[PDB]
Design a protein around this ligand. Structure first.
Ligand SMILES: [Zn+2]
Ligand SMILES: [Zn+2]
Ligand SMILES: [Zn+2]
Ligand SMILES: [Zn+2]
Lengths: 44, 100, 115, 70, 107, 557, 47, 199, 462
């Protein structure tokens, strides 16, 4: 379920991600990735 | 060093201007239902952060119900800053008002 | 209730685009429990309880060498009623790039359901 | 990310770390050896009656610098 | 609660001379230095250092970016609490060519 | 509340940035309009540079940080032509239509301008009556005597303010009242009528014909009628119809006008008194260099299996391609007719793209392209846009909506809450010695049983969740609450275990047509098991005016 | 007509004092009506 | 035009009060007193004892770090003076709570003692050790100093081993040494000091 | 390679007046090889190369000069150099304090990361500390805080934990001015393992508490000695533990196995205990204290007295000179609010300490005899008076603590409240009064290994 992508902070390891609450993505242990932007758009 | 001297002299004199002392104060001697709100917020907002509690709380976990146990005994150490729209103010303690 | 869903690879495919990705799994992989929702052609068993987060079809491409399944894009406990393996028009012979899949959402009268 | 997130602890400056405005109200005036060593006799007597255990020792070395020998 | 504390509660940094929010910046430090906060339009580069008999610096305004340019200027910031959309409007007011020279009162 | 805020903002100023300080703040100008090529690359010197914040999970150039911590930055664009800001073509055209193109002044008088100059000096303080009595104190047009009239009006005004500053009436900051502001719009609007209509000049007999505009691009010096050509030279002794004027020649007119008639325009623009004495010049009307928004405020949208390009990069590169072409066409007329007709058309597609960067209802363009691609004025003018859309109408966290229902077994100051709501909404409850009997049982339960908690918070600000744990770690960390930190900054700040919503929290409620404010009240939460909808009492529904046809009422914890 | 006023307000050099509720929200300031018209100050017992 | 705007910069960095060469020791005078004004953030838990809360949270981490406002390493303080917000000296003064926090901020006068290094100074402190291209020192048993061969004359060679110094008298050099201070560089957290020898 | 490689790097020394940095990134990168690689530097080219480094820094130092200094400081296993070049390699790190007063940051990164390695591996770092922390006062901040940044992971083995504690305990005996934080980081992060075992009451965690905390109790036993109490600072270690026991371990709930570190030290002589329990009188009997922060200390005091062997028999009467004298104060003052309409829920402070006095009586019975058949201040008459009063303590004491108050008062004829024990079926929020009448802070310990250090100083059953 995890993707090929970036490494981030929280000092676990060189890590991977997947979205849980659709835009405040976390690491393995539920640590909040500080400041995502989550581009979207509404239709009509 | 020298221009903060021309900055605290001006400000605290200007702060000394718009004070209205205990003999000249002529606003209401009541607690005007928003004062009762913001006291019971910010007094309860302090007690959440381990501020000293001047009442014998007996099994209460809510900071709000604890702060409504100090207001019932006139214990809350706050001073209300009632502004007037010129800029002036009158300073009012919790002890000298009447909670409705 | 019912609702059907188009599963189109040819919506991305251009005219002279070769037939790139194909329903079913592939190799250089083994993610399990997709075999518990899907059948060997990468199309699910009819009557299998799906949710959100669950695989709905396995299309293994050949430009990335990995089965990138798509997922039931709703939040209600559904099933699969019937699957239809849809052919193509301008030819007679190429593999399918269009599936239709029919869902069975059950809806008892819960509280709030208007009379 | 890995280097950018721990810079919140590099500065680590809340309002419980730093004062907000730092304005010297007056001019700098020099203090002599008889005044510093009397300041260091007065103030270091006060903080010995918690943390600051590291910087007390650092000022004891300056204290012994004006009364003793390394 | 419902327009700052639970929509876009943001603590940005404001330069207390030029009055901006965007043009403040965490300094990219020297490899043993500490990342401080330095502004942009109060910051002029080190090249403007014409000529007491010298113009020596007491290691105060000297900061560099990731590009490496020595700038002299841009200190004296603080922490405010704004909605983030104010920061977005300030860019969109800059797009028109209109600044927002703020005032920040502890001085 | 454990992340406190120090200093704070109280007032906003306005005014226009210089040509100089856009460069002092940002020397990262952009020349490449082609934003992305093969391998999707953000080119340095293009609109999606890393010098304007980080982008595509990179590190920023100038911030030195990732795409998640850089704000982005600003970047100028060298415009070799004076593209005026289209929100200021109203003003400069009116200041042009009185500025005499021969005598390097207005057409007006020395003292007629000075009256409105001196009266706005009185209307920037808390005094209106002296602005009228200034018109009263007056006295064969001999300017040798009338310098005493110049020596008389403002000399009173030198002391009328000094009389007023002697009182507590006004300070040198001034006084700005609506009744002061009402009469300020009566000088200036009348000042902007007689300047707009003058026959000749006064300090000479020479003058200009009527400037005629178009839809906010062109300025013409029209054909003077044959009575008035002679009237410049019968006094001045002792080309075709609608000759085009361009913003360089317009800036040539606006040099000795804002320089010489500075004292009037020091008070016309600055409504408050001037604690800055910066001179007024036409460079604030024109946009000499543009700016570029941050990368975070400029990325293309995406939907479905697609990506959709931003508005403000299509019409930012189209500036720069014209900036490319107006740089390319430099050497052609520099090394030698119709070459000027090739040249003058380059001052329209650079005019229509500062017009399209800001407006879109003020641009000619080509066709009507289904509500065409906006500028930035159009990002701010509707019910949608920004102010009503996301400044007045900010969407909120910690909030739900449901279908109301009758329930007569709850109190009239209450609401019934399902366990679906009761395991999502959290309250950041700090820890003490009196709540520790409950917050320890909150971490034992977790977000499975209702009297519980979702995630906790140490003294650093870490949102250590409680999802992956179980009864081993959940019993362990509850006694990891009263263990103070040896980090010296964090010895006051106690821990905030985000519990669920309890039987004692009070929650707003909201019908969607809120006409009377009593559609927005507060309720003690009673969490009802075995349910999936809100539960309301009949006492409430006479106040909210919401019958039980199943209305979506919001809810705010 | 947002930018119509924003035309004139920058022509005004308007030092906006942020005292209306349709301006204290713009900067997110505490609104001056009700529980925000008056400050609340703590009297500490010691010097 | 650009002659009176430069005075905004010349008056900006240049400290006023010099280090005069006092008591003919060779050392100038660098320990200097200045009073300041903070802007504290008093804790809610230090409401009962508000003098202990201002000092512990903002003054105990203030000593023995270089301070970019005074331009000196803060040696020590004494004498907190919390102001008041009621312009009525006495005990029950009153401070102003921030509207969103329980943290109430106020003004304090307090008195500092710092260390003042400048250019053109000459100081004396013990040498710890040395090398054939640099010589490191200690000042007041708190303050480093380093003298390198680009500050040292040519004929001063080096006896080689710990290898000691050889001057023009041919002697390993003593502890206390007179030296002229070059530009101070505060790159590390430890305050680094550069110095010269020639006049 | 004898003197060829000296002039080879003397040409790389020439990069101040030549400025090319050609040979900089070869040998320092060749010494940037890992430690188990047989391609790297020998000991013969270790000498004269670093004599160019020790005697010269001006002809290197730049932003380019960082490179040949990084790879030499970060040389892992740097005590595996020959002792005729350990004199030389330290002589480069000696002057590293004196070259630029910034690079002492970088060695202290590695000094505390080698605290994981034992004394038998890394004995040389202790000589570097005392010979240079006297030199540098203005660095003690990140000295004190890198025991938290280089702190070992919570799920380590014993090899990263039994030797990290050994670098902390040996060091304060020769670094006696860094301060309070040194002792505290144990008591702070003993509880990270303590609470993770009584919820498990697999065996990785127990030997972290058995044999690694054994070093904690052994070293503090060696800090209390009959000369550090007379002229040294054996009371100073008692000071820094007295001001620490009140902070991190007493307010935390259900906390066994850790308070023995306080319990093992202050049991020796008359001096430490007559300043630790009179401090506890200021804790567990003060009006100014929180009335809900006093039930546990009156329960903690109750099980200290009846589980400690080296206290005098005249010192146990000192408890009953004040705890029973505390019941000479409730008898006058507050025996008069019961006829006022109010239950006994307000007196959960009063039955907190009254349990502890009966907790002594259930254990200490054969101590206070005389030859003349009496008891100390009429022990067989005090528990008769305070039970038959109008408070009915038989219901508000636990059944198990009254099962044991009854059999003892039947054999020696102390109390005869047996027919009133029977009269509680027709006589009888609540959870905070049953657990603290059963939580005992000095339980017989599940750990079999720590009781080696505490066989005598902890009392058995009988
Ligand atoms: Zn980590
Ligand atoms: Zn700025
Ligand atoms: Zn940047
Ligand atoms: Zn004229």
């Amino acid at each position: 379920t995890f993707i090929r992508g970036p490494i981030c902070g929280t000092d676990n390891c060189p890590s991977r991600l997947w979205r849980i609450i659709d835009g405040r993505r976390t690491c393995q242990y539920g640590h909040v990735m500080e400041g995502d932007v989550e581009f979207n758009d509404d239709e009509d | 060093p020298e221009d903060f001297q021309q900055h605290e002299q001006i400000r605290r004199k200007t702060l000394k201007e718009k004070a209205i002392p205990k003999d000249q104060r002529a606003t209401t001697p009541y607690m005007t239902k928003y004062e009762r709100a913001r006291i019971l917020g910010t007094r309860a907002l302090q007690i959440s952060m381990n501020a000293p509690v001047f009442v014998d709380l007996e099994g209460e976990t809510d900071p709000l119900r604890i702060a409504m146990k100090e207001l019932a005994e006139k214990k809350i150490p706050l001073v209300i800053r009632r502004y007037l729209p010129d800029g002036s103010f009158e300073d009012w303690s919790v002890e000298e008002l009447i909670v409705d | 209730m019912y609702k059907t869903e188009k599963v189109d690879l040819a919506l991305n495919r251009n005219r002279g685009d070769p037939i790139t990705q194909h329903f079913g799994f592939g190799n250089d992989e083994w993610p399990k429990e997709w075999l518990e929702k899907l059948d060997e052609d990468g199309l699910p068993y009819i009557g299998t309880y799906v949710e959100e987060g669950d695989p709905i079809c396995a299309y293994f491409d050949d430009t990335l060498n990995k089965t990138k399944i798509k997922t039931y894009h709703s939040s209600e406990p559904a099933y699969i009623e019937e699957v239809n393996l849809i052919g193509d028009e301008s030819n007679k012979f190429q593999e399918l790039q269009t599936v239709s899949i029919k869902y069975r959402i059950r809806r008892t009268p819960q509280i709030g359901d208007k009379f | 990310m890995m280097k950018g997130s721990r810079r919140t602890g590099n500065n680590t400056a809340t309002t419980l770390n730093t004062p907000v405005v730092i304005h010297a109200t007056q001019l700098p005036q020099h203090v002599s050896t008889d005044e510093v060593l009397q300041f260091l006799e007065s103030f270091i007597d006060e903080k010995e009656n918690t943390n600051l255990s590291s910087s007390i020792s650092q000022l004891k070395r300056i204290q012994r610098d004006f009364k003793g020998l390394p | 609660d419902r327009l700052l504390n639970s929509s876009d509660y943001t603590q940005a940094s404001v330069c207390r001379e030029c009055g901006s929010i965007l043009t403040t910046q965490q300094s990219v430090p020297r490899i043993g230095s500490i990342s401080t906060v330095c502004c942009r339009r109060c910051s002029m580069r080190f090249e403007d250092a014409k000529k007491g008999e010298k113009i020596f610096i007491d290691d105060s305004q000297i900061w560099e970016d990731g590009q490496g340019n020595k700038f002299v200027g841009g200190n004296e910031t603080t922490t405010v609490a704004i909605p983030f959309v104010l920061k977005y409007l300030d860019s969109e007011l800059s797009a028109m060519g209109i600044r927002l020279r703020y005032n920040v009162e502890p001085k | 509340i454990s992340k406190p805020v120090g200093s704070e903002i109280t007032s906003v100023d306005f005014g226009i940035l210089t040509a100089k300080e856009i460069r002092n703040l940002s020397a990262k100008q952009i020349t490449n309009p082609t934003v992305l090529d093969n391998l999707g690359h953000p080119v340095s010197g293009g609109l999606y540079d890393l010098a304007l914040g980080a982008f595509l999970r990179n590190l920023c150039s100038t911030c030195g940080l990732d795409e998640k911590f850089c704000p982005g930055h600003q970047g100028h664009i060298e415009l070799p032509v004076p593209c005026y800001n289209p929100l200021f073509f109203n003003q400069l055209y009116i200041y042009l239509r009185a500025s005499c193109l021969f005598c390097h002044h207005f057409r007006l008088k020395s003292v007629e301008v000075h009256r409105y100059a001196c009266k706005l000096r009185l209307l920037q303080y808390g005094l209106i009556d002296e602005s009228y009595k200034l018109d009263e104190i007056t006295l064969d047009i001999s300017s040798t005597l009338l310098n005493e009239l110049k020596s008389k009006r403002s000399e009173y005004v030198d002391m009328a303010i000094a009389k007023a500053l002697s009182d507590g009436r006004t300070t040198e900051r001034g006084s700005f009242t609506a009744t002061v502001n009402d009469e300020r719009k009566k000088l200036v609007h009348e000042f902007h009528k007689k300047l707009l209509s003058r026959g000749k000049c006064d300090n000479c007999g020479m003058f200009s014909p009527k400037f005629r505009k178009d839809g906010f691009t062109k300025i013409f010096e029209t054909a003077l009628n044959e009575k008035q050509i002679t009237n410049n030279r019968v006094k001045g002794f002792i080309k075709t119809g609608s000759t085009y004027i361009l913003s360089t020649e317009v800036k040539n007119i606006l040099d000795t006008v804002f320089r010489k008639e500075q004292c009037v325009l020091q008070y016309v623009f600055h409504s408050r008194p001037n604690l800055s004495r910066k001179l007024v010049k036409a460079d604030s009307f024109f946009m000499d260099v543009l700016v570029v928004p941050p990368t975070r405020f400029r990325l293309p949208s995406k939907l479905g299996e697609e990506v959709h390009e931003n508005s403000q990069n299509q019409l930012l590169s189209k500036v720069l391609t014209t900036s490319l072409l107006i740089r390319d066409l430099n050497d052609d007329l520099s090394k030698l007719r119709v070459i000027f007709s090739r040249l003058m058309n380059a001052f329209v597609t650079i005019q229509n793209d500062v017009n399209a960067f800001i407006d879109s209802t003020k641009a000619q363009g080509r066709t009507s392209g289904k509500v065409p691609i906006p500028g930035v004025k159009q990002a701010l003018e509707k019910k949608e846009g920004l102010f009503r859309k996301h400044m007045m109408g900010k969407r909120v966290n910690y909030a739900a909506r449901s279908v109301i229902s009758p329930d007569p077994n709850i109190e009239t100051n209450e609401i019934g809450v399902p366990p679906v709501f009761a395991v999502k909404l959290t309250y950041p409850e700090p820890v003490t010695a009196y709540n520790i009997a409950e917050l320890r049982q909150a971490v034992i339960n977790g977000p499975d049983k209702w009297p519980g908690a979702t995630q906790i918070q140490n003294e650093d600000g870490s949102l250590v969740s409680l999802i992956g744990m179980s009864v081993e770690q959940r019993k362990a960390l509850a006694n990891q609450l009263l263990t103070p930190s040896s980090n010296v900054s964090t010895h006051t700040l106690n821990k905030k275990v985000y519990r669920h919503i309890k039987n004692r929290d009070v929650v707003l409620m909201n019908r969607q047509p809120t006409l009377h404010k009593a559609s927005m009240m507060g309720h003690k939460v009673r969490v009802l098991p075995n349910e999936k909808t809100l539960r309301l009492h009949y006492a409430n529904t006479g106040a909210y005016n919401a019958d039980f046809d199943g209305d979506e009422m919001n809810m705010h914890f | 007509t947002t930018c119509q006023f924003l035309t004139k307000a920058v022509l005004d050099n308007e030092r906006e004092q942020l005292d209306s509720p349709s301006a204290r929200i713009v900067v997110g300031k505490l609104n001056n009506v009700g529980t925000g018209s008056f400050d609340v100050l703590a009297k500490v017992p010691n010097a | 035009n650009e002659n009176r705007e430069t005075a905004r910069f010349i008056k900006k960095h240049k400290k006023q009060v010099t280090n005069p060469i006092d008591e003919k020791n060779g050392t100038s005078n660098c320990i200097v007193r200045v009073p300041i004004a903070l802007y504290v953030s008093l804790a809610p838990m230090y409401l009962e004892n508000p003098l202990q809360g201002v000092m512990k949270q903002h003054l105990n981490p203030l000593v023995m770090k270089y301070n970019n406002k005074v331009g000196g390493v803060v040696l020590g303080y004494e004498g907190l003076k919390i102001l008041d917000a009621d312009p009525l000296d006495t005990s029950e003064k009153l401070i102003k709570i921030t509207p969103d926090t329980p943290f109430g901020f106020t003004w304090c006068h307090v008195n500092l003692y710092v260390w003042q290094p400048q250019v053109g100074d000459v100081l004396e402190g013990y040498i710890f050790i040395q090398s054939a291209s640099h010589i490191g020192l200690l000042i007041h048993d708190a303050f480093n100093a380093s003298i390198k061969k680009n500050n040292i004359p040519v004929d001063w060679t080096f006896v080689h081993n710990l290898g000691h110094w050889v001057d023009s008298n041919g002697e390993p050099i003593d502890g206390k040494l007179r030296f002229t201070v070059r530009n101070v560089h505060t790159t590390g957290r430890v305050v680094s000091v550069d110095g010269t020898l020639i006049s | 390679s004898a003197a060829m490689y000296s002039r080879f790097v003397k040409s790389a020394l020439d990069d101040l007046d030549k400025n090319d940095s050609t040979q900089i990134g070869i040998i320092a990168n060749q010494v940037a090889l890992p430690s188990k690689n047989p391609e790297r530097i020998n000991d013969k080219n270790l000498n004269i190369l670093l004599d160019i480094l020790s005697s010269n820094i001006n002809r290197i130092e730049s932003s380019r000069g960082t490179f040949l200094i990084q790879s030499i400081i970060n040389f892992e296993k740097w005590w595996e150099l020959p002792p005729h070049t350990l004199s030389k390699y330290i002589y480069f790190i000696k002057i590293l304090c004196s070259s630029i007063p910034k690079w002492w940051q970088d060695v202290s990164m590695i000094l505390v990361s080698c605290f994981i390695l034992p004394i038998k591996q890394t004995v040389c770092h202790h000589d570097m500390l005392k010979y240079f922390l006297r030199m540098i006062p203005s660095s003690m901040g990140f000295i004190d805080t890198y025991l938290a940044k280089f702190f070992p992971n919570k799920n380590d083995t014993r090899r990263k934990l039994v030797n990290y504690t050994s670098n902390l305990l040996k060091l304060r005996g020769y670094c006696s001015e860094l301060g309070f934080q040194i002792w505290s980081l144990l008591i702070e992060k003993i509880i990270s393992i303590d609470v993770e075992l009584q919820n498990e009451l697999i065996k990785e965690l127990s030997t972290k508490l058995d044999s690694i905390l054994t070093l904690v109790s052994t070293h503090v036993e060696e800090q209390v000695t009959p000369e550090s109490l007379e002229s040294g600072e054996g009371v100073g270690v008692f000071n820094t533990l007295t001001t620490l026991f009140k902070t991190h371990v007493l307010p935390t709930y259900y906390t066994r196995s850790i308070q023995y570190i306080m319990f093992h030290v202050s049991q020796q002589q008359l001096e430490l205990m007559d300043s630790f329990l009179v401090t506890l009188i200021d804790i567990s009997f003060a009006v100014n204290e929180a009335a809900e922060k006093k039930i546990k200390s009156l329960q903690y005091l109750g099980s200290y007295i009846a589980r400690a062997k080296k206290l005098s028999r005249t010192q146990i009467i000192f408890v009953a000179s004040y705890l029973t004298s505390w019941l000479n104060r409730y008898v006058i003052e507050r025996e008069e609010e019961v006829d006022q309409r109010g239950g006994m829920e307000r007196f959960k402070h009063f039955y907190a300490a009254f349990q502890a006095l009966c907790y002594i009586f259930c254990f200490r019975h054969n101590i206070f005899r005389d030859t003349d058949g009496n008891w100390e201040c009429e022990l067989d008459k005090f528990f008769q008076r305070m039970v038959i009063s109008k408070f009915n303590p038989l219901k508000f004491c636990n059944e198990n603590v009254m099962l044991m108050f009854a059999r003892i008062a039947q054999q020696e004829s102390v109390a005869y409240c047996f027919s009133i024990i029977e009269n509680n079926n027709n006589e009888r929020t609540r959870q905070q009064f049953i657990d603290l009448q059963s939580y005992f802070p000095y339980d017989p310990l599940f750990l079999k290994n720590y009781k080696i250090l505490m066989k005598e100083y902890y009392i058995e059953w009988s």
